[PDB]
Amino acid sequence: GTFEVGKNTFLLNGEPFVVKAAEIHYPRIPKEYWEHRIKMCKALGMNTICLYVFWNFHEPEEGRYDFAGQKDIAAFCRLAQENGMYVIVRPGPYVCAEWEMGGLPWWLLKKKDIKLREQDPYYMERVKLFLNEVGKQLADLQISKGGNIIMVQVENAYGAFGIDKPYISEIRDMVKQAGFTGVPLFQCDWNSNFENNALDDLLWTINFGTGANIDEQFKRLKELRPDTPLMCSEFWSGWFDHWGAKHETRSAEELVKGMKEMLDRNISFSLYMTHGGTSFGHWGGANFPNFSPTCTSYDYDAPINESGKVTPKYLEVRNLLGNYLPEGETLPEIPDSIPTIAIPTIKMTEMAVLFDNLPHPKESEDIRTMEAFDQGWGSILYRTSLSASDKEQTLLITEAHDWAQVFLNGKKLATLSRLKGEGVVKLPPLKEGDRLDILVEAMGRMNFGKGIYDWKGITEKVELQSDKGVELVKDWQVYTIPVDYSFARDKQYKQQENAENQPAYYRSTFNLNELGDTFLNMMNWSKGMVWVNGHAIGRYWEIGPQQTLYVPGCWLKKGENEIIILDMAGPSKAETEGLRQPILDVQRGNGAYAHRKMGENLDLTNETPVYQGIFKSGNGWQHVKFGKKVETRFFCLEALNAHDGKDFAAIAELELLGEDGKPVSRQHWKVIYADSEETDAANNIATNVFDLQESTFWHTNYSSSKPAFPHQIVIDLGEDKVITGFSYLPRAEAGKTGMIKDYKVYLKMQPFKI
Numbered sequence: 001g002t003f004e005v006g007k008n009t010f011l012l013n014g015e016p017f018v019v020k021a022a023e024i025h026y027p028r029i030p031k032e033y034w035e036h037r038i039k040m041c042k043a044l045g046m047n048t049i050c051l052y053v054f055w056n057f058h059e060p061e062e063g064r065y066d067f068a069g070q071k072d073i074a075a076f077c078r079l080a081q082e083n084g085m086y087v088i089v090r091p092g093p094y095v096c097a098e099w100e101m102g103g104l105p106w107w108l109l110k111k112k113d114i115k116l117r118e119q120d121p122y123y124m125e126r127v128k129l130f131l132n133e134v135g136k137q138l139a140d141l142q143i144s145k146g147g148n149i150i151m152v153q154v155e156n157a158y159g160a161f162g163i164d165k166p167y168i169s170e171i172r173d174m175v176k177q178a179g180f181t182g183v184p185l186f187q188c189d190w191n192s193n194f195e196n197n198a199l200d201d202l203l204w205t206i207n208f209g210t211g212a213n214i215d216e217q218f219k220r221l222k223e224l225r226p227d228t229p230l231m232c233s234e235f236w237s238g239w240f241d242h243w244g245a246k247h248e249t250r251s252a253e254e255l256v257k258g259m260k261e262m263l264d265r266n267i268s269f270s271l272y273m274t275h276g277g278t279s280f281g282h283w284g285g286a287n288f289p290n291f292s293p294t295c296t297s298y299d300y301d302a303p304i305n306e307s308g309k310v311t312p313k314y315l316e317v318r319n320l321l322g323n324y325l326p327e328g329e330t331l332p333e334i335p336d337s338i339p340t341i342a343i344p345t346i347k348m349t350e351m352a353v354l355f356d357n358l359p360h361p362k363e364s365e366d367i368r369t370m371e372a373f374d375q376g377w378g379s380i381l382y383r384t385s386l387s388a389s390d391k392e393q394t395l396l397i398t399e400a401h402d403w404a405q406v407f408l409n410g411k412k413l414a415t416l417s418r419l420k421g422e423g424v425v426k427l428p429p430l431k432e433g434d435r436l437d438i439l440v441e442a443m444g445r446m447n448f449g450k451g452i453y454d455w456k457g458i459t460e461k462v463e464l465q466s467d468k469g470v471e472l473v474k475d476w477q478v479y480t481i482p483v484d485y486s487f488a489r490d491k492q493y494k495q496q497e498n499a500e501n502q503p504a505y506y507r508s509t510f511n512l513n514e515l516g517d518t519f520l521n522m523m524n525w526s527k528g529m530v531w532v533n534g535h536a537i538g539r540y541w542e543i544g545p546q547q548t549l550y551v552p553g554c555w556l557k558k559g560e561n562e563i564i565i566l567d568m569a570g571p572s573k574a575e576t577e578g579l580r581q582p583i584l585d586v587q588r589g590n591g592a593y594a595h596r597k598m599g600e601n602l603d604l605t606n607e608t609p610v611y612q613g614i615f616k617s618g619n620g621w622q623h624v625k626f627g628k629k630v631e632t633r634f635f636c637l638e639a640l641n642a643h644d645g646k647d648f649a650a651i652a653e654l655e656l657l658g659e660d661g662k663p664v665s666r667q668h669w670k671v672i673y674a675d676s677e678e679t680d681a682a683n684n685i686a687t688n689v690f691d692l693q694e695s696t697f698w699h700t701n702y703s704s705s706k707p708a709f710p711h712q713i714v715i716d717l718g719e720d721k722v723i724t725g726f727s728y729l730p731r732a733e734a735g736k737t738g739m740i741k742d743y744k745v746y747l748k749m750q751p752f753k754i
């Protein structure tokens with residue numbers, strides 16, 4: 001067969017063909033259910049499956065490649081072929097995907113000066129070798145060799161990382177050298193950045209979300225390439241969740257409207273995610289703002305939910321896609337759901353306290369990261385002894401990646417979270433030889449932007465601060481606590497209760513006479529991870545919004561089953577249970593879910609704006625130069641009205657421009673104040689202005705208080721910076737509220753009055 005880029009169309013075996021693809025991810029779906037999920041995608045109206053290849057899933061240790069069982073990507077593609085569906089493969093080497101390090105293997109970071117997603121010779125050689133392995137698995141499944149693979153993506157959304165055409169060209173060449181020479185190669189990006197890395201000989205595709213202004217997404221592309229076929233390579237069907245935040249949803253009605261608009265113009269798309277599944281085990285990622293780890297669940301509000309079930313969105317999409325079939329044809333029947341069971345209360349009566357079950361220590365004079373000790377995943381304990389002190393001191397940990405508990409002679413003093421930028425602990429007076437323990441749990445490595453440079457453990461150093469000065473702390477005992485099931489199983493379990501909330505493994509067995517999917521209730525538990533019959537189910541955290549872990553019935557057995565829970569901070573009750581429905585929407589954070597509280601009223605009365613302006617109407621980036629340089633710690637944008645004359649303001653992204661006229665780093669930014677936020681009907685929290693996601697936005701309240709203009713957002717830059725201008729991106733939809741018109745900008749060194 002053939003697949004070709006034609007004149008305003010794709011051609012499948014010489015005939016016009018509109019790609020209607022479903023994104024599903026083989027590691028996020030138990031292998032026993034691959035067929036069921038593919039059949040769900042076919043019944044929805046799709047003709048193609050789109051998938052990433054996840055490098056770190058196949059080469060978790062250097063030189064050791066695995067493509068068996070759950071990792072059998074060729075078997076996955078053949079299953080799609082057997083069900084009459086084409087495949088698009090996106091082999092990376094970086095895939096983002098809310099997945100550990102964006103698919104990159106942690107062991108790259110053993111080279112401390114490595115450069116990632118650039119032509120670093122060590123990185124590039126490992127990429128070459130990995131792609132070659134993918135080629136041996138998949139090149140013979142190109143449509144041109146009798147298989148079903150129709151296109152291959154080169155890299156992934158490089159426009160959101162940098163500008164490096166020689167890099168992308170070399171990746172393209174490595175994809176070809178691996179054997180992918182028979183089908184079109186393409187690169188994806190946003191409508192705002194695709195030109196930066198666009199190569200003459202690749203197809204250019206665009207990614208955007210439910211509700212986007214479709215014409216705006218493709219207009220510039222058609223000025224450059226009047227005859228290119230148009231494809232949305234990721235049409236976001238929903239969104240992912242962050243630990244501590246609200247469960248995300250997106251409108252089915254809006255999705256269908258955009259899908260219809262594309263299909264009425266024969267525009268191709270791949271729906272991301274069509275079924276998301278679960279980031280099982282340690283494989284979940286982390287992204288912006290700051291460090292924001294993503295939930296274990298990848299339900300995504302996709303049409304096919306986490307456990308493979310029909311949703312109202314599925315039914316709306318199917319109703320639409322049923323009208324776009326070659327004449328005569330009807331959609332296949334929707335597969336039956338996989339049965340569910342409830343599992344009665346499981347009492348976790350056996351426990352092995354972590355600090356009483358430690359491995360052999362490595363002695364290290366200096367702090368080093370976990371990768372320096374040949375550890376990629378899990379937790380790491382750093383232990384030392386301290387000198388006598390009659391006065392209190394401060395312990396400075398620089399920096400804990402990601403969630404550290406500090407103990408003194410076994411008594412917990414504090415918890416330090418990277419989500420909160422924490423690194424300081426007050427120590428009481430010390431006796432000579434007092435034992436300091438810093439247990440650092442590593443969550444996923446960041447999967448987006450420059451966050452992929454994510455070394456775990458303590459990144460640099462530990463210091464003691466007294467009135468005398470600051471002293472580096474040396475002479476450590478280091479204990480690797482790996483995620484391997486074998487490590488969790490090999491512990492001295494005893495019938496015991498956790499009086500002191502110490503980190504511990506908990507074990508129980510339970511009988512089952514009939515099997516089905518279930519949802520393990522973690523509401524009683526603190527933070528940690530779970531194994532069921534050896535299978536690593538994923539991470540949990542009491543802050544939510546996710547409170548249940550999906551447990552596939554194919555990982556349960558008749559007769560005796562085993563559950564082990566690693567719980568870091570102690571459960572409120574040492575019991576769990578299996579529910580027939582998940583809990584995905586229960587937050588239990590510290591403080592109100594808002595950037596304004598009682599008694600806060602921003603007062604601009606004695607402030608003079610740096611700039612007053614008017615934004616243009618409609619969609620797309622706007623860049624503003626102030627014609628001067630201002631040293632800034634705090635930035636306030638005061639929106640005065642909107643283009644529609646209504647009471648709401650919204651912002652998708654804000655950047656501030658430095659002395660060189662380019663965006664400053666937002667790594668350390670903080671929203672100090674937003675006058676109003678919608679957090680009930682949607683998750684339009686104010687940090688959405690710096691998550692590097694053009695599909696997410698801050699929006700003022702509309703569901704209850706619905707306050708009028710003026711509206712304001714105040715940002716702490718986290719450091720003093722010389723600012724020359726700023727950039728504003730409104731929400732991506734057409735015809736919606738909150739398109740700011742008149743505005744003022746204020747820049748200060750001292751705090752605003754709030």
Ligand SMILES: OC[C@H]1O[C@H](O)[C@H](O)[C@@H](O)[C@H]1O
Pocket residue numbers: 095096097098156157207234240
């Ligand atoms: O879900 C958000 C989405 O963002 C980008 O489009 C990436 O290419 C995807 O891998 C995914 O991370």
Ligand SMILES: [Ca+2]
Pocket residue numbers: 652653688689690691692693694695696697
């Ligand atoms: Ca955003």
